[PDB]
Every structure is written in structure tokens, then in C-alpha cells.
Amino acid sequence: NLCPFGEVFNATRFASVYAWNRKRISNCVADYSVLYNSASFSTFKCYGVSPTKLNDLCFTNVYADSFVIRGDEVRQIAPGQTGKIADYNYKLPDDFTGCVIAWNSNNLDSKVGGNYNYLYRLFRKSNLKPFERDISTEIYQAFPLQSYGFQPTNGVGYQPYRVVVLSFEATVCGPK
Amino acid sequence: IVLTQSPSSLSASVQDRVTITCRASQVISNYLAWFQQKPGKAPKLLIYAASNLQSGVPSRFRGSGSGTDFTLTISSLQPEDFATYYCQQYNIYPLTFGGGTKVDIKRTVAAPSVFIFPPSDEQLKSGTASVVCLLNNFYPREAKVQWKVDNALQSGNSQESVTEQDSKDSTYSLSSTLTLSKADYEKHKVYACEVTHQGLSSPVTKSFNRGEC
Amino acid sequence: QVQLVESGGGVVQPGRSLRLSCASSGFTFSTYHMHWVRQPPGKGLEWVAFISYDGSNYYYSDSVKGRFTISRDNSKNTVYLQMNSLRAEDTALYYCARDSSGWHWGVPFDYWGQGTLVTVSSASTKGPSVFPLAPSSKTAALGCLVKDYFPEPVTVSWNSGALTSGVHTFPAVLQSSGLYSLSSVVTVPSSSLGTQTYICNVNHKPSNTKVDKRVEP
Ligand SMILES: *[C@@H]1O[C@H](CO)[C@@H](O)[C@H](O)[C@H]1NC(C)=O
């Protein structure tokens, strides 16, 4: 049976980065070549795996996380990196294995008056563990979610980017 | 975002390498596109994301650049490549186009032949006077036409138009039209247009006395 | 196959309103953003407006914001441009173009319709006056001045199409009256000015006018 990657990459809606969407990808055949055959990604960085040779591998499970961040914040979506999103919204493990994939989505995720639907966590008692997810709405002590307010006129690093993270972990294989 | 596209025009020959520059007034990452347009036809996408060739576009079209400064290169110009090219930044609203680059055919320098036409009696009976100065079959396109009425240089009362490059001898032709009321035309005697063109060693004057025949 | 067809253009007085349509076929219209860009006569490309695939996101150029409104009907595969408070500077061929930029697979402005011409003008339809540019008293040149007509275009031939070589019919110029004027010229051998008669034939379809003017020494 076939892996439903189309629902991940072509999904109308993406979640805020604090409520980052995870879907388990298991017991199926996937063709990632359809991804490489795309020259429109702004970031396609694999850790521990070469992208062009990835059909040739098999794995136990595949998990695909997805969310929307600012363009200059895609930097924190990397092994062991830190900052405001990698500390409080979405952290990768220092031993991450897989690929981070992002593209500009200004035409989908900005509004004229500012889009306040996309949210991020500003500050929490501690940094998150790898793959930890925090949807708490507890007021922080010196409401912890603020709005990106994506506008179409925003400069490059201010604009919204959609990110899909492929964590590689048998049940899922390539061409069969 | 202002796009400064250079040069605004150029002459080239088949098999030449053509380079067109686009500089943005602020950084736009790689979100630049290049278009080609032929007369009477709609624009056609050549390159998006600064360097990705659109499917069906020949490989001699290359785009480069990120940030502020971008380049379109045609590595070996072909006869179907003579046209106008535009750059565009498509991600930062309001959307913006460069000023265009018209690529015409190089040929050898040719001076214009110059002709002046007084107004017809038929037009004068109607109440207007159009004086025409014709520059015929010259190259390159740059030319200057100045009107002098009784030796006074005229401003603001004339209009020019130019043909497209001739398909057989690759020249241009130009008309400059001085338009006056009948009353004003009768105020003066001598009508002259002076033509300056790099194919002419000195400017050429054609003139006539009003009412001469 | 992929098609974009604009419609609605015409001649309208300044201050009036006009609605343009762009009908798509041959692709999934519902997931493509749509843009209008215009091209004034003899000038370059100018972006006008954008509407996202849903119709939820949308933007305008500074030159039309507040006067134009963009909308779409995905059930009918069409995008619209409502143009209010028109002005002479809005005269342009108005193109429609699709855009899938923002999807991971997306390409910006990859297909354009052929455009619909919008002319904002106070002038009324009027056929041309035609005057001779007589060949000079002393290769000769002659021609016809084709003055004060509206709207574009006019057609000019010489001796009912028998004379083609050495003819130049110039682009019309728009005069401050709002009418157009152009010349058509021919170069010919001087020796032929007695033997050979020369007549320019001017056709102006919008006013159903045709004029023949013989051009004499
Ligand atoms: C999303 O849709 C496009 C166009 O149909 C397709 O090329 C792409 O492969 C789709 N995404 C995935 C990952 O299936």
C-alpha cells in the first residue's frame, strides 16, 4: 500500500508551530523521488542520510511533523540548534536522522491586515525535550502564545514558511 | 521594491552571449522571475526562483543571483530570441516588474535620408498645420530631431514615432510632426528640422519658406 | 489544454466603471492564485492585483488600491476585476495570469491569457481626415497624413496593395485632444513622379470610413 505524503505536503491548512502536527507514516510504500523532483523548496537539509539515495533505503517507521514559522526562524530547525522556536516550540534531538523541508508560503498564509491565526510560544519554565509538544495555555511567570501577524508586504525573513520534518526510524520502504 | 533592469535596450548578433542585469532595492532572496515578450504576444515565463528553467525553455537561458543582484544570460543568441525581457519579484507585495530590455538586431551604421513636408493647403483650409520631418532607414535607433521656426528652437509642440526594426534590412524609420494652429503657422516664414545621427558626420537641416513651391 | 481567456474590455469614459473577466480551462482552477497585470500602449508590464486560490488573500498595486476590486468564482472557473472610477492612465491591455507559488510544487506566472484591451477616453468614434504629403519640388518621398481619428486602429495601403516596397506606416500618436494621428510614407524613384500615380487607401473600421487620397507633385 502507498504512503500518504500528499496529505502532508499539499495540506490546505498547517498548524501553528506550538501545536505542530505529527502523523505516523507506517506500513506502506513511498516514493520520495517525487520530492527531489521539486526545485521549489527553499530548504532541504538531511542529517545522516543523502537525499538522492533515499529510495534505496528502508526503515521501521517514518514520522512527518509540519508547522508554519517565519523564514528567518527555519534556522532553528536543525540538530542541537536553539533559539525561540527550538527552545519553546519544536526541538530536534542532537542525534537527529532525517530531512528538514521548507518553502515560502506567503500566498497561502499571509493576510492583508496581518494573519494572527499562526501562533508561537514565547517563554516556558524550561526548554522542550526532542519531539516534545506543548499546547499549554498557562500564563508564564517572570499568555504565552503570540501571533506572527504575517502580512503580504513583509520582508524576506518575516514571511511565513511551511516546514515538513521527516524523522527516520521494518514497515515502510521505497520502490517495490 | 524597485527593480533596476539594465540595459534598457541592446543590439546583438546571432551566436552572441547576452547578459541582462536586475538589481532589487531590497533583498528578495531568490524570488525573481524572468519573462520574454514578443510584439502583439503575451509574456512567457523563462525562469522562476532566480535560476530554475521553466519546462520547454531552451538551456541557453540561464539565471543567476540571490539577495539583491540578479542576471539573465543567453549564452548563444538565436534568431527567435530577439525580443523584450522583463524581470519580476513575485513574493513581496506590492508585486514589481523591471523596466524591460529590448534586444534588437545589430547591423552596420546607416545614416537617415531626411525629408520635410510643409502642410497641405487642404489641411490649412481646415485650420491646422502639421509639418512633417521624415528620417528613413537608419541604424542605430538613437536619433535627435529639432525644429526651428524662424531660427527659434521649438519645444512641446511636436511628437515622434518610430517603426519597429525592418524585417529585411534591420533599419528604423522615424517621423517627427510639428503641429501648430493655422494662425501660428502664418506668424512665421522659415520652417526647419535638424537631424543628428551618428551615421552623419554633421547634423542635416531640411527647411522651406512657407508659401514656396 | 491550459487556457486563460480575458473578456470585457472596451472604450469607456473616465469616471465610469468596468468589470473584466478571465475564464480558465484545462487545469484545476481552484488551487491556483490569479493575477491581473496591465501593459499600457507602448510601455512595460505593470502588476495590478492578486487573489489567492481561496479568495481569502488578496492585494492591489498602489496605483489602483481603493478603485479596483478583485474577486473569483471557483465554481465557474473565472476571476474578475471590478474597475471603478476609471482614469485615462488605466488605458492598457489587461492580462490575466495563474500562479501556484506558495505550494511546495508551485510556479509563479507560468501562464498568461492574451489580454483584453481597456481604453479610457472622452473621445467619440471619429473617422480620419487624410492629407497628402506631396513629394518635394526638387529617390523621392511622399505619403499621407492620417489625422484626428478614434479609436485605434486604422489601416493604410498604397495603390490598393500594388505598392508595398519602401512603405512605412508609423505607429499612431495619441494627441492631447484624445484623437490619434499617424503618417504613412513611401520612397520611390524620382523619375516615376510623372508616370506613376500614388494613392493611399485609409480604412477605419470602427467608424466604417474608407478614404482614398491621391498624392500629387
Ligand atoms: C502535491 O501536488 C502536486 C501537483 O499535483 C504534486 O506534483 C505533488 O507531488 C503533490 N505532493 C505530494 C508530496 O504528493
| 3-state per-residue secondary structure call for chain A | CECCHHHHHCCCCCCECCCCEEEEECCEECCCHHHHCCCCCCEEEEECCCHHHCCCCEECCEEEEEEEEEHHHHHHCCCCCCCHHHHHCCCCCCCCCEEEEEEECHHHHCCCCCECCCEEECCCCCCCCCCCCCCCCCCCCCCCEEECCECCCCCHHHCEEEEEEEEECCCEECCC
CATH 2.60.40.10 positions along chain C are 3-120, 129-215
Instruction: Tell me the three cell numbers of residue C163.
Output: 505598392
Q: Tell whether B37 lies on the interface with C, counting CB pairs under 8 A.
A: yes
Which of C28, C105, C107, C110 would you mutate first to test chain A, the one with the most A CBs within 10 A?
Answer: C105
**What's the DSSP call for residue B13?**
-
* CA nearest to A151 within chain B: B93
Label the pairing between strands A172-173 and A28-29: parallel
Helix or strand or coil: residue C175? coil
Instruction: Tell me the three cell numbers of residue B33.
Output: 522571475
> What HEC string does C102-145 produce?
CECCCCCCCEECCCEEEEECCCCCECCEEEEECCCCCCEEEEEE
Nearest CB partner across the interface for B45, out of C46, C109, C129: C109
Nearest of B27, B180, B176, B160 to residue B114 by alpha carbon: B176
B99:C61 CB<8 A: no
Nearest of A64, A131, A150 to residue A101 by alpha carbon: A64
Instruction: Tell me the three cell numbers of residue C97.
Output: 495570469
Helix or strand or coil: residue B180? strand
Question: CA A25, A30, A34: angle at the middle one, nearest 5?
Answer: 120
Specify the CATH number for B113-209; select among 3.40.50.1820, 2.60.40.10, 2.40.37.10, 2.40.110.10.
Answer: 2.60.40.10
Whether domain C3-120 has CATH 2.60.40.10: the reply is yes
List of residues 6+ apart from B23 with CB closer than 8 A: B3, B4, B6, B68, B69, B70
**What's the DSSP call for residue C170?**
P
Measuring from atom 7 of ligand 1, which residue has the nearest CA? C105
**Distances, alpha carbon C71 to alpha carbons A51, C6, C62, C81, C200, in Å:** 41, 14, 18, 7, 48
C-alpha neighbours within 13 Å on the C-beta side of residue C149: 27
CA–CA distance, A5 with A147 (Å, rounded to integer): 28
Nearest of B21, B202, B13, B212 to residue B100 by alpha carbon: B21
Neighbours of A141 (CB within 10 A): 6
Strand partners, C143: C133, C185
Q: How far does the CA of residue A155 sit from the closest CA of chain B (Å)?
A: 7
| Pocket of ligand 1 contains residue A5 by CB under 6 Å | yes
Q: How was this structure determined?
A: X-ray
CA–CA distance, C8 with A123 (Å, rounded to integer): 55
- What is the helix (H) or strand (E) element at residue B183, kind and residue range? helix B182-186
**Resolution limit in angstroms?**
2.1
Measuring from atom 12 of ligand 1, which residue has the nearest CA? A6
Nearest of A106, A112, A83, A89 to residue A165 by alpha carbon: A89
Cis upstream peptide for C14 (omega within 30°): no
- CATH, domain range B3-105: 2.60.40.10
CATH topology of domain C129-215: Immunoglobulin-like (2.60.40)
Domain segments of chain B as ranges:
3-105, 113-209
